[PDB]
Ligand binder design. Structure first.
Ligand code: 2GE
Length: 154
């Protein structure tokens, strides 16, 4: 049983981060970066850009490679293969979409309590400008059974 490709784009700036409140579907009622499924016929980076445009209304020329996290759940055959990107520069205005309502948070005021539990572990690596690689086994949606997390030169 193989995995499916996901992207996650974190809109960063010197003092703040633009998260998105998920309004519907998987992760509804939680703050997260912008992203979703990688389709057939686009590269992973194209998918990241697309989902950022569609969910926030923002454009980019380029993204940074910051993380590669593989998620799995107990009693589930399908794995999430997440390619995490930072967008430290953006064009346009943040606009509320059907799927996401964007909001700015200062980097010392990130609402980890209402984000996915894994974010508390890998966000510090992102904010130190470290590239990271890891696996997370979830018991349920609020409970990490086991996890592995390391930095990489890549
Ligand atoms: N921060 C974070 N954490 C996650 N933790 C995994 C237990 C669910 C999953 C995701 C994610 C990334 C891209 C697309 C989608 Cl649908 C999701 Cl849910 N993001």
């Amino acid at each position: 049983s193989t995995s499916r490709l996901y992207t996650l784009v974190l809109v960063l700036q010197p003092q703040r981060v633009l998260l998105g409140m998920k309004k519907r579907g998987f992760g509804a009622g939680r703050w997260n970066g912008f992203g979703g499924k990688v389709q057939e016929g686009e590269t992973i980076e194209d998918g990241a850009k697309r989902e950022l445009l569609e969910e926030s209304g923002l454009s980019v020329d380029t993204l940074h490679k910051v993380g590669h996290i593989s998620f799995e759940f107990v009693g589930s055959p399908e794995l999430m293969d997440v390619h995490i990107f930072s967008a430290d520069h953006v064009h346009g205005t943040p606009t509320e979409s059907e799927e996401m309502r964007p909001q700015w948070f200062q980097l010392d005021q990130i609402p980890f309590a209402d984000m996915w539990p894994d974010d508390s572990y890998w966000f510090p690596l992102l904010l130190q400008k470290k590239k990271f690689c890891g696996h997370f086994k979830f018991q349920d949606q609020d409970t990490i059974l086991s996890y592995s997390l390391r930095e990489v030169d890549s």
